[PDB]
Amino acid sequence: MSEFRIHHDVNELLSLLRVHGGDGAEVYIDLLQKNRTPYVTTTVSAHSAKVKIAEFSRTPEDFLKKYDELKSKNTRNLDPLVYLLSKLMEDRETLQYLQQNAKERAELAGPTWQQSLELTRKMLRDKQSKKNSGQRLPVLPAWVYERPALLGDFLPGTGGSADTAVPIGSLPLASQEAAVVEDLLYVLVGVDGRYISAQPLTGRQGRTFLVDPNLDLSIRELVSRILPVAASYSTVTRFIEEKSSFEYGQVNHALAAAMRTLVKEYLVLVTQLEQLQRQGLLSLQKLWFYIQPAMRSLDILASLATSVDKGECIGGATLSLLHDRSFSYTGDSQAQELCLHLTKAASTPYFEILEKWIYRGIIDDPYSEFMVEEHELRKEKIQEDYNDKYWDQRYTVVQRQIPSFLQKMAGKVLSTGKYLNVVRECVVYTLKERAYVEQIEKAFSYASKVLLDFLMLAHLRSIKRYFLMDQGDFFVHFMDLTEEELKKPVDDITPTRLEALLELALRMSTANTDPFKDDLKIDLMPHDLITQLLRVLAIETQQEKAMVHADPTELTLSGLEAFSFDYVVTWPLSLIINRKALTRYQMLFRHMFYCKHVERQLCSVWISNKAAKRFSLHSAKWFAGAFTLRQRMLNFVQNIQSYMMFEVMEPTWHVLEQNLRSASNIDDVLGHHASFLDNCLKDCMLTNPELLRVFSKLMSVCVMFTNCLQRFTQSMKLDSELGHPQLASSFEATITKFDKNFSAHLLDLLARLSIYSTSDCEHGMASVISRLDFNGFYTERL
Amino acid sequence: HDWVYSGVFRDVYGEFMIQVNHEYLGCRDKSYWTHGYVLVSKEVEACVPVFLKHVAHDVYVCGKTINLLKLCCVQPDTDPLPVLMKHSVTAPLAAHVSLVNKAAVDYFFVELHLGAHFEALRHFLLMEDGEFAQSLSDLLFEKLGAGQTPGELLSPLVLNSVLSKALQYSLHGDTPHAANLSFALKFLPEAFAPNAPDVLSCLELRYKVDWPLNIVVTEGCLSRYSGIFSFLLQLKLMMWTLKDVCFHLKRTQFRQLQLFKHEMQHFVKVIQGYIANQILHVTWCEFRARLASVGDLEEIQRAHAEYLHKAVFRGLLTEKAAPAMNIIHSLFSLVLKFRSQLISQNFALMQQSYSTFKYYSHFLFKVVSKLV
Amino acid sequence: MKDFENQITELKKENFNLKLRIYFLEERMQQEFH
Amino acid sequence: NMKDFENQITELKKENFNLKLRIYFLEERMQQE
Amino acid sequence: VLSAEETELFELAQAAGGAMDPEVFKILVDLLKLNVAPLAVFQMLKSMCAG
């Protein structure tokens, strides 16, 4: 459900139970995620579990009935659910705490089986109509429902025969036998008898058949013995003529076809037996004996049909019902051949759909019977949404549109199908999954490989050039354009003229051989770099309350720190880049761009102080101190930049490239990209709010110092270049405050880096500690 | 058949001893022998009716091995007509169970190189590579010496980086199974009374073994291999100090010290050749020429376990020989204390080292006679 | 190991509240925009 | 051992940052919608 | 909170005994759907409730 659904479940349970201590949600989540069965398919000591539930039951019968109903609805995790409930109610303390939590959360805040099936048909047609988003449904005019009881089936309202009714007792034994055989065979064809009467049924169940009490005790005994066959055939023909029409799923119609085939063979046999009894060459014992495997199959298929009808299974739900029907017994056969053939024919449309989906990628919903429930989603919007819609909502995962055998490898099947569908847009049933599991395995491996070859380095090259500021001469040129906008955030102005300035700067630099910069666009964030970073490093923490009043006016003013790069790419490349990664990209790019702007401003100040050489040494002592302070600022900025580029970004880019060049799976590529982004953000000290705040304060004070410098720097430069106590008054008292603040922020950064290296043991803080203390004057000040 | 040929046993309700309850294949921290076997009591106990127990355990183990390998792959009515049995059915089943087990263990032997891992752990974790060790330990002692380290080799970064420099030079190594060696400390090197005469060297060298072989080559054999690595390390320290003292004499009481050195070195050499016959030769021969080749999964584990037992037995780690081995440490220590002076290019210290060596060899002979 | 144990406990508690907020926001969005 | 706890802390610092960014972008989406 | 299947499993749960919050039952159903070992889920639900 959730990407961190173990954590979310732990948190919700702890909130409901009013528990936030003990071991902690961490231990429970970790033990849940680290101690797991592959999938919930193992059976338990199920009858011991049944006994335990019964002993904690007020009434075991209704609990067993609910279990049976859920099995008729092929529910998942039912025997394991009973086992877990038994283990829970074993302990009184856990039980009582759970009930106490539930009480706390509580206080703190007539249709017949034919009519039911017609209403179910209408609702299922409506459902497939919506689930298909408007795709066609199989609809035909049928008068079969207008008179089903008259077409050899059994419906509420059936009986015996009002036109064929004679006293069987008054009849001779042979005549009674003939009459009873005829009535039995009519019941076994679904129509009423003459002395065996199909009784009405409420709700779709096995059709019961009443035997006239006039029959002889042995005769009536054997009539009742057959009556199982009569009820089986009546229910079989009712299901046959109900699913015979195409309103339910493909599997339902295929099952009806196979069932009516077997019913027609059973009725051929029934007519042969009727004739043999007519000539007096049959006995009730021989009738019971002849079709013993046949009657076994009839009972098995009646149970399967009744489970289908009660749980209204269809699609993979019905497939799971059939698989469980043929899998509950398993091995050794007397009548399971019929059920296996029926299951294969029922899953033939579903198997063909799955083959098309996982061998070519073609998929569609005739009634949303399949694993896939169609939901059209935009591929491009994946790049604009934090959640990737293609995997989640484009094709969904359910527990009633998925066959029981296919659900085991549903993830691999779905991945291969999505790969093959991306490729194009650019199968038989077995008693065991393996037989087709290895199929969908190999089809997965090909689906990924071919998808990779259909999808391809150039995009990562453009990302490195723009976001990672490789060939940063364009960024040096853009520094001067961004410098004209320092009052209000850039988001106040449309990005069209910003992109026009960028493109007019482009053609003056060597950038012709990069056909990937057209995928870059300018986004106006509603927050500046410093503010957004602080809120990211303060969310889900007590810092959000404190810094909700924070503003960038007291700190460095943001007039160009909201500019960021985004990479919008078309499908299926729109699946690779998503808004969850785009937000990290934007934050990193804005931080890099503001750091580069600060460094270029510092270097420009230093180079413009070249006109100080036009003056003597002993008249710039205050200027000398200011220059030393700004040189320390620039050196710290340059060291930070060199570390965080040539010790972080190049190695992480190389690791990402190696992962892409080795792997082929797009999902694995996305995972590698996400891990790379996380590593980049952690090496940027974006996982420690204290360090991110210290970094922001340091670079803000550097920007403020350089902005205060530039005015009088330009003034004295103009004075010197036009002429060819004044210098002390030009040197303001704020320079000493700036120097002290820079020293304090540097010491705080070093201290926090060492503290985090000793406690958190992150790999990036020791490097910042080493770069901060590399002169023999701060390593004992660490 | 399902379990023998596919390594899983099916239960639908569960009321029997044999079952599969397999752990997932996503967790690769198992050894793959942890699959289900939860017992059930049968419904019979009168004479305790049973299936054929000859195969009843066999199927249980064979199916678990099949699951592990699939990751990579009588009559009393008067009528074998008389006589009820199950051997006409057991033989065709056992044939396939055995074939599956053989194939699994052969795959282990030929693909995961379990015997190569065993020889790697012998070479590295038991310090069997000479002229590698007789430069590695010497260069360690240059940064240490006289038994205990003098505040060095306290953390596994100096020793590991010396090992990294040493690793290009070896007489057994330069293999994928001789790479990824773990050199570590189980005790930081700080004595509560540092002494110049000492031979005590303990460090733990290990060799990586892949997951499917880490049921044969258990940690319990690697720990004994590292214990004998430490014993041979103390021996290499003693021969290092003897080389030092020979160099000290060479570059030049002296003759008497050399006489006592020769007598002690003779006796220590004969003791060391007894040790490096019984604990170093016969168990090494029966651990190199012990890997399974008929393809037994179990036999590799049993062979390693017996290799370890025999190495310890002839290593004198058994309580009967423990005093003898402890006296060997004191003889080494006395001969090192003697050799640390030698010719300088203390006579009293040399006489003390000679007396201690004679005491050590006397005590060794007394322990050996007492155990005899 | 105690320092890393408490650091990971604090991080997991922060992610527990983060994921509770995420679930709340998902409920808000599904109750509003659906 | 201590490596597991160190790995967990390293993983959960980034996980906390990821959850914070997810919250921030969800709030931005609700602001824009 | 509870879905149709969650409600059905909740009624089966009350038939087997024990009162439990709809959100907690949703969490338990999610954990069972996540293919977690029944022994593991039992142990950790005991840890949650008894804690």
UniProtKB/TrEMBL annotation, chain A:
Keywords for this protein: Cytoplasm, Cytoskeleton, Microtubule
GO CC terms in record: centrosome; ciliary basal body; microtubule; nucleoplasm; spindle pole
Principal subcellular localisation of the protein: cytoplasm
GO BP annotations listed: brain development; microtubule nucleation; neuron migration
Gene Ontology molecular function: any one: gamma-tubulin binding
Cytoplasm as UniProt keyword: yes
Subcellular location: Cytoplasm, Cytoskeleton, Microtubule organizing center, Centrosome
One Pfam short name: GCP_N_terminal
Ranges where the Gamma tubulin complex component C-terminal domain occurs: 457-778
Keyword Cytoplasm: yes
InterPro entries xrefs: GCP (IPR007259), GCP_C (IPR040457), GCP_C_sf (IPR042241), GCP_N (IPR041470)
Domain Gamma tubulin complex component protein N-terminal: from-to ranges: 181-456
PANTHER family in the cross-refs: GAMMA TUBULIN COMPLEX PROTEIN (PTHR19302), GAMMA-TUBULIN COMPLEX COMPONENT 2 (PTHR19302:SF13)
Subunit structure: Component of the gamma-tubulin ring complex (gTuRC) consisting of TUBGCP2, TUBGCP3, TUBGCP4, TUBGCP5 and TUBGCP6 and gamma-tubulin TUBG1 or TUBG2. TUBGCP2, TUBGCP3, TUBGCP4, TUBGCP5 and TUBGCP6 assemble in a 5:5:2:1:1 stoichiometry; each is associated with a gamma-tubulin, thereby arranging 14 gamma-tubulins in a helical manner. Gamma-tubulin at the first position is blocked by TUBGCP3 at the last position, allowing 13 protafilaments to grow into a microtubule.
Family the UniProt entry places it in: Belongs to the TUBGCP family.
Name of the protein described by the UniProt record: Gamma-tubulin complex component
Organism listed in the record: Sus scrofa (Pig)
From TrEMBL, chain B:
Gene Ontology terms: biological process: cytoplasmic microtubule organization; meiotic cell cycle; microtubule nucleation; mitotic cell cycle; spindle assembly
Gamma tubulin complex component C-terminal domain span: 114-372
Keyword Cytoplasm in record: yes
Keyword annotations from UniProtKB, A to Z: Coiled coil, Cytoplasm, Cytoskeleton, Microtubule
Any one cellular-component term (Gene Ontology): centrosome
Subcellular location: Cytoplasm, Cytoskeleton, Microtubule organizing center, Centrosome
GO MF annotation, one: gamma-tubulin binding
Subunit relationships: Component of the gamma-tubulin ring complex (gTuRC) consisting of TUBGCP2, TUBGCP3, TUBGCP4, TUBGCP5 and TUBGCP6 and gamma-tubulin TUBG1 or TUBG2. TUBGCP2, TUBGCP3, TUBGCP4, TUBGCP5 and TUBGCP6 assemble in a 5:5:2:1:1 stoichiometry; each is associated with a gamma-tubulin, thereby arranging 14 gamma-tubulins in a helical manner. Gamma-tubulin at the first position is blocked by TUBGCP3 at the last position, allowing 13 protafilaments to grow into a microtubule.
Function: Component of the gamma-tubulin ring complex (gTuRC) which mediates microtubule nucleation. The gTuRC regulates the minus-end nucleation of alpha-beta tubulin heterodimers that grow into microtubule protafilaments, a critical step in centrosome duplication and spindle formation.
Family recorded in the similarity comment: Belongs to the TUBGCP family.
Protein name: Gamma-tubulin complex component 6
Organism: Sus scrofa
Portion held of the full protein: 537 to 1691 of 1715
TrEMBL record, chain C:
Superkingdom of source: Eukaryota
Transmembrane segments: none
Subcellular location per the Swiss-Prot or TrEMBL entry: Cytoplasm, Cytoskeleton, Microtubule organizing center, Centrosome; Golgi apparatus
Protein name per its UniProtKB record: CDK5 regulatory subunit-associated protein 2
Protein's organism: Homo sapiens (Human)
Highest classification ranks of the organism: Eukaryota, Metazoa, Chordata, Craniata, Vertebrata
Protein's gene: CDK5RAP2
Span of the entire protein shown here: 60 to 93 of 1663
Automatic annotation (TrEMBL), chain E:
Cellular localisation: Cytoplasm, Cytoskeleton, Microtubule organizing center, Centrosome; Cytoplasm, Cytoskeleton, Spindle
UniProt similarity note: Belongs to the MOZART2 family.
Coiled-coil annotated spans: none
Identification of the protein by name: Mitotic-spindle organizing protein 2A isoform X4
Native source organism of the sequence: Sus scrofa
